[PDB]
Amino acid sequence: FEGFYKLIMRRNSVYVTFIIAGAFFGERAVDYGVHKLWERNNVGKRYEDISVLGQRP
Amino acid sequence: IDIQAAAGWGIAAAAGAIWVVQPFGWIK
């Protein structure tokens, strides 16, 4: 808590590391959330939802 | 202030390398 907190606002190297970590996780969290809502809005329309998938003849 | 700052930026650079290049699977 206080240890990381105090380091972030007192050393710019820790703050830059904090920015990189927040960019990395915040980007993945949004990409995960966007894709979950894309899946909920497109039920039945995915390539893996084709009934005849695998029997061409 | 000279070694602490050097380790701090070395950590920032290493995290940035892991962030730009994301070799999640090269940990072998």
């Binding site: 606002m9 007192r10 050393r11 710019n12 190297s13 | 202030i1 700052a5 701090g8």
Partner: protein, 48 residues
Amino acid sequence: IDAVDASTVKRVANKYIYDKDIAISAIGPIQDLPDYNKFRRRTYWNRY
């Protein structure tokens, strides 16, 4: 006084100086004096 060593000065300076607000009182031909944001920014060093 003797108790105030180099570690003491840095500790006290971080409590009173680092990234702290300042008060400015200027008079005369002071157009070239930097503004509040310039003085405010110069209370920390971003290379550390």
